[PDB]
Design a protein around this ligand. Structure first.
Ligand code: ADP
Ligand code: MG
Lengths: 153, 48
């Protein structure tokens, strides 16, 4: 039996695997502090692994084994630079925009604020100014220009 | 059997021959302290 989720480490050194709803669920899989220590897992890590039905007196299924972390084999977890330790730089890879239902918006944005990778951007508008619709256009344009980029909304 | 000591063979334990059920009746409560009501909760904050 296989389960998957995102790692959420508790105060007590153990964690749970969550679903898209991003909360506590009945189907979350227990992860012992051990597995965390061997695989050097961290909060937000995506864990997939074969699980078993919980034993009697157990309320949550337990991850018998870890197969992949963040879609890659667990070994790279032990030896990797920590995110906090990554060298920040300026956004050096522009992302050019277009969305078919409104190319006016995307082209104006490109002419107004070209987008790069690592961008810390903001759109500022009063209520009812298309900010939501503009964000929709950006989502659509990124899902056409940069499918490789993990698009989280 | 020294002064009034009684020596017993094992069998009376092998047989269900001297036993009773003892009943214990514990109790607790939560209060609303001016420092803060004492929630009856499952939480042990610190360690385990
Ligand atoms: N590019 C657009 N074309 C047509 N209608 C728009 C456009 N941008 C905004 N609107 C209209 O403005 C209203 C508010 O847009 P939206 O950004 O979704 O809400 P808010 O800006 O209040 O969060 C919507 O009802 C929408 O019909
Ligand atoms: Mg809005």
């Amino acid at each position: 039996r296989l389960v998957k989720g995102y790692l959420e480490i508790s105060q007590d050194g153990y964690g749970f695997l969550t679903e898209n709803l991003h909360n506590l669920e009945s189907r979350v899989a227990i992860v012992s502090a051990g597995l965390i220590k061997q695989y050097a897992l961290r909060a937000g890590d995506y864990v997939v692994g074969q699980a078993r039905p919980p034993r009697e007196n157990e309320r949550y299924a337990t991850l018998l084994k870890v197969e992949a972390v963040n879609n890659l084999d667990p070994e790279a977890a032990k030896n990797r630079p920590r995110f906090d330790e990554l060298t920040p730089q300026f956004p050096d890879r522009q992302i050019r925009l277009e969305t078919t239902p409104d190319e006016l918006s995307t082209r104006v944005i490109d002419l107004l604020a070209p987008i790069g990778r690592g961008q810390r951007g903001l759109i500022v508008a009063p209520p009812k100014a298309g900010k939501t619709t503009l964000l929709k256009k950006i989502a659509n344009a990124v899902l056409k220009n940069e499918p490789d980029i993990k698009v989280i909304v | 059997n020294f002064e009034d000591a009684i020596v017993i063979s094992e069998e009376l334990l092998k047989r269900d021959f001297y036993t009773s059920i003892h009943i214990e009746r514990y109790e607790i409560e939560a209060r609303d302290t001016k420092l803060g009501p004492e929630r009856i909760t499952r939480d042990i904050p610190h360690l385990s």
